[PDB]
Subunit: 211 residues, 3 copies
């Protein structure tokens, strides 16, 4: 695996069983850490760590195609095992963190960020009022196409976010579909799978952990 470093005390640990074809990984700064686990396919992506003390953690069996990712100083991106991601954008700044859980499915066109990238202040006392806020995406979350996840949003486990939805606020209820304008729970007590089965979840051995 080839990449560009400018700086020192960086640790780039990419498993020999993983593939990174057509991916550019650039590390500019010091004390940054990259971990890519076994049997990953991180393809046609552009990942830029610019700053110090940055952490990128990608667990085993993760498949990414066409991610554009920018991390700044003291920021963390963690993506857990068996997650798949199509084309999309992740930006982290303001020393923040974004976490994506196990076996998520992120469809084409996601935009996920913990930051507005410019400050907004109160006229009453001058104080900044739009500080960055971490994003937490739970286990087994499916983002439909063209979903935008903004700062501070926490998504519960086993959730479907409907295509073309923008989330500004966190939710607490697991096992639901969230969609609409504004985003709201539109269906409760569900589970999603990858492979289209015509009739029943019991036909899909991969889903036993949810019921």
């Amino acid at each position: 695996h080839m990449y560009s470093e400018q700086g020192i005390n960086n640790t780039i640990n990419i498993s020999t069983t993983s593939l990174t074809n057509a991916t550019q990984l650039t590390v500019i700064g010091n004390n940054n850490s990259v971990y890519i686990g076994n049997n990953c396919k991180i393809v046609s992506s552009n990942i830029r760590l610019k700053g110090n003390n940055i952490t990128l953690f990608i667990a085993d069996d993760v498949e990414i195609m066409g991610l554009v990712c920018s991390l700044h100083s003291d920021c963390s991106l963690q993506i857990q095992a068996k997650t798949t991601m199509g084309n999309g954008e992740i930006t982290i700044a303001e020393k923040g963190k974004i976490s994506i859980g196990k076996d998520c499915m992120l469809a084409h066109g996601y935009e996920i960020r913990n930051t507005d990238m410019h400050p907004i202040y109160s006229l009453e006392n001058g104080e900044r009022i739009n500080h960055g806020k971490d994003v937490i995406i739970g286990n087994h979350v499916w983002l439909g196409r063209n979903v935008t996840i903004l700062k501070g949003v926490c998504i519960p486990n086993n959730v479907v976010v409907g295509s073309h939805t923008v989330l500004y606020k966190s939710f607490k209820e697991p096992n639901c579909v969230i969609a609409g304008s504004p985003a709201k729970i539109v269906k409760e007590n569900i589970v999603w799978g990858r492979k289209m089965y015509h009739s029943t979840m019991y036909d899909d051995p991969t889903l036993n952990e949810f019921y």
Copy 2:
């Protein structure tokens, strides 16, 4: 007209008066049917029929630029006469159908589909609850730019859908503008035309059938 077939009992009937420059039509499977009527211009498009028993019907005088279309087994796309379509995406799966009526105008950036492409099941009994559902777009419908039409949606005749609108549900009232979040009827008893006339529909001979 050149195209790729892999399979048999396919029928590809493209009128000798129609143009298909820079269009890729791929048929992979058996017993599929393609009809393109007279005086069509189907340009810079990518149309893939992968499966068996697929029907693609495009009537006379249809102009398409930059359509990306995927059809799977037993699916049907029907587009009626004088309809125009700019760049966009149509996906049909789950043995479903999408119909577009006569003299529609689909502006840049449409996404139309009858499927979520992955299953959602009820935790209560395991049953699938997001089966594909047909899409019916009536006669003389105008989709403004960047409109998304999701599964099951039926749009009445002589409707304008405002740009950047997502439709999840069907409507019944013809001769209206639907726009907003959620999509709603914002104007009733109207008719749209193609050519900008400054003052009156009576100046446009092409609109006599609507009043």
Copy 3:
């Protein structure tokens, strides 16, 4: 600075201190006027004036990257000093005007227009009911990413429009954030800046005019 003219009585006044690399400016028609002030950077853009009596006014210190702009007869685009604009689209037709104030920041993916580009008529009397309407963006407005501003919209001074918001209607209150579906005021009595300061607006000498 090179450009294409087809027609006469055009005036193309581009300051010798401004840069227009990779920008195509095309003027097709008569009596059109282009002014680009000092120390501008108008880059990788495509600006087409097709018609007569068109005015394009760009003041000093304006930086534009990847604007696609179309103006038709008797239309006006005015962009005031120190405004910055990333990639985006502006369309003006129906002899209308779009104005953008001083020191605005237009993030990637804006779409701004004064026109529906096709007519909608009343069935009751045949009259056109969707005439073009001017767009006025005030001083010190920040459009977040992928914002759409439709015809007739006036935005007050010192406003933030949240990313992925569509505005259909004007607002009157300055010093606010507008976001959501439908767009609404979500925060009042604020001011935004460009450079991320961790704690206070008083640290940014460029903002003294707002409190």
